[model samples]
Target: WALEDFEIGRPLGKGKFGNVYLAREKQSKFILALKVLFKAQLEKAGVEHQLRREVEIQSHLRHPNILRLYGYFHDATRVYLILEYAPLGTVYRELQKLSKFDEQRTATYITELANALSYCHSKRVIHRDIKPENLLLGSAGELKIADFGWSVHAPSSGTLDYLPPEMIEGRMHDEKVDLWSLGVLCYEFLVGKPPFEANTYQETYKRISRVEFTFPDFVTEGARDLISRLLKHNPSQRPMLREVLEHPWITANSSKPSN
Candidate 1:
């Protein structure tokens, strides 16, 4: 379908490279997530290569929990990714309503993410970034992972909250980069914020470099065990995604499930 086949709607969110909007594909009458990246910012360089890699990786990926790149098109000044709109909307938006999710839901969503990551690994794809902005829910409340916006590099305060220490250290790192984000996500979902957060970027970096984190009284030790394992500075030290799925916290899920 050409650009004219879809009707643009409301603003969805903003990102470093560009913005996302709600859109409708006239042929199917299906809602879509329209990702528009700036031609100007796309010229910024690191992001263009990232955009190329993002499309390269996501195009061949097929997972129940991964977002589909339904279509792709653009004009002279913009790049558009017409993706399957996770109509239930952003997890960041959901945070406003729920503040934070219950432990059960967190485990449920993390379990889904673990499986999706495993699927990506099987396909030899790596997720360079993972955070709430790129996560959504299906009509039936299943987790959906979208890899796009984070490909751009104009830093946001919150994005740094999930950053990998190897990135800060400016060292070569492997897919273990994702385990760091996973640890941060585990904390962020349990509380209203990430564990390494501070008033400034430097302080936040200090905490992340030290792998420093503490839990609130309400968080379970079982979860602490799982998250603690994930925060390891060395990639080899972190548990495999399969091991993450096997953890007692994930296995037990919740005594009282939100689902």
Candidate 2:
């Protein structure tokens, strides 16, 4: 779908590796997000393989909460990855405005993510990354899993505040990493900061290395219990996604799972 210079539009957002732009197909008027990244940049960052796998992984999925990467192609040393549009925006701002806690909202998002993450697991694709920045809100206020850049078919922990303890030192892992990330994300949603957040990276790693974190006084016991369950240093000890969805806190605070 590249090569044709399909009506360039304004910048949607700036990414660490590239920028996304609004674009449209003249005839169908099908609007989309065009994620443009430079070959030179990816070559220098040494993530050509990563990008390819990301494309491969995302091209196969279709779920309500999962963002769709429609297709990708290269042009003049640049790669344009086109994706389905979300009229709202990333969930980061919502978290910014709505923090430090909203049991219903946080649990609702976790439910959506759990559903999407489970679907990914069933497909043998590990998202490996789940953060507010990687999630988006659709027109219906649904959460969409937006970025698959760090995902792998049988593979891959990602992000600072969200890193699982095993990923800190150990290597081989499966879908368990996302469980840990979910724990951290829940903490952030409830407390307005990542549970392991510290003044320095060293301190942060030290806290995460030991799973050393405590909840703010306002956090409920149900939420605390679920977070503690997933925050376990042992990945295998962490509950599976289905168990996660069935947790007392989730069932209590979330609406029933829907497509």
Candidate 3:
């Protein structure tokens, strides 16, 4: 569908690439989201490959916890990719409504995400980006991996911030890239912010390069242990997806006191 196809008053979202619209077809009235992209802008930003990656990767993926890209079509000046609409919105924004996360909610979210990642890993896909912003909620609080923008075939090496120290220091890597990001996501979900933060990207990279991971005394022992294993300096030493989920910090705790 094109921008003209959308009815009035329904807005989806705005981004550097394009605008998303909530609209319905004239005859069927089925709820759908239409993502509109400007071809000129896409070429200008050199995102044509990225767009192609999203569509190609999404077309092959089939998971209950992952967003669905129905199909794509184009007109003279614009391109459109139809996507499934999730009413609950982005999971990152949902966490903002609370001051912090209780253990139960955090573990539930993390476990479901792990299960989804395990599924993706089984299919040989590594989600290079697994930040909270890329998560969404479907019916009954089901978690969905929202954006496929950074997803790619498991390469010899992967992204920096989400890569293990072995990869950062120049070593071969694989599906473990998702495991690293999964750990980061788990920490952010529990702590209500990212594990690593700095005023500049360079400093962030520096900390990551050094494997400078520490938890404040304010954080619980179980929480710190989980983050420690997830943020291990060596990729080989970090726990696998199944092991991470079954760790004492996650499986042992039934609840965490709300702050």
Candidate 4:
């Protein structure tokens, strides 16, 4: 479609680097999300490889809960990605809609994400950013893993949010970084915020450097146990991504759990 085509529908949202729109295909009457990025901006940020990798990897990653890329095209001024639409938008903005998710809901959400993350790991892809803003809810309440701009080939060096504490001190990272992000995402899902945040980047860096966040007292012991294990200070000590699905919170019937 053309730029003029997307103006008719609702504006989807924006990220630091780009803007997205939900529009319908003129030929098929099928609706889709069109992400438009400026080549100049990406070039300025030196994220061209990141953008290309997102397109290539997302196109190949087929899973129930991950967003799919339909096609990609670029011109001198702009790059365009055609993506499947998630009507519910981002979970970040939606968290306020509900007071917060209880334990059972959080478990279901994390389990869904875990299954998707497991698939990404098996295929050797690492979604470096796994925060709430990158997740969208589909029609059936399924989580769609969106925004692959920071995604990289699995076994690559990790990003700050998902990296283990040892990685912060310059350790090599693999798929375990994704698990760390998943754990952080789980924390945000239950607590309604990112695991670490401060007034400034320096302070945020300090919290990350300290790596001292923990399970809230209100959370169940089993749930806290799993979160602590996943948020271990040592990368080697953290549980593998695939093992999170078996945590007791996920296995048993639980309440709308709070932390």
For each candidate, the alpha-carbon lDDT, in order, equals: 0.79, 0.85, 0.73, 0.75
Error of 4 at 54 (Å): 1.3
Task: Kindly list the per-residue Cα lDDT of model 4 for residues 1-259, writing each as its tens digit.
Answer: 4555443366698866678888777767779888889888888987988888778889998887899898887766888888899988778877878746777777877887888888887888877678777899888877889988878874555235555555566656777777777778777777776677566666666677687676666777776777778776666788875567777767773322211
Estimate the TM-score for candidate 2. 0.95
Question: Clashing residue pairs in candidate 1, if any?
Answer: none
In model 1, which regions exceed 4 Å deviation? 149-158, 254-259
Off by over 4 Å in 3: 1-9, 156-173, 253-259
Q: Model 1, poorest ten-residue lDDT window?
A: 149-158
Tens digit of lDDT per residue, candidate 2, span 155-259? 543346888877777677778898999999888988889999888888888999899999879999999999999999888899999898988889889975733
Candidates 1 and 4 compared: the better one by lDDT is 1
Candidate that beats the other on lDDT, 2 or 3, i.e. the better one: 2
In model 4, what lDDT does residue 248 have? 73
Summarize candidate 1's per-residue lDDT along 139-255 as a digit string, tens digits.
988888996444322221244688787778777666666677888898889887889989998899899889988999888899889989999987789988878878889879843
In terms of lDDT, which candidate is strongest?
2
Q: Which residue pairs of candidate 4 clash? A: 102-256, 102-257, 103-256, 103-257
- TM-score (C-alpha, index-matched) for candidate 1: 0.90
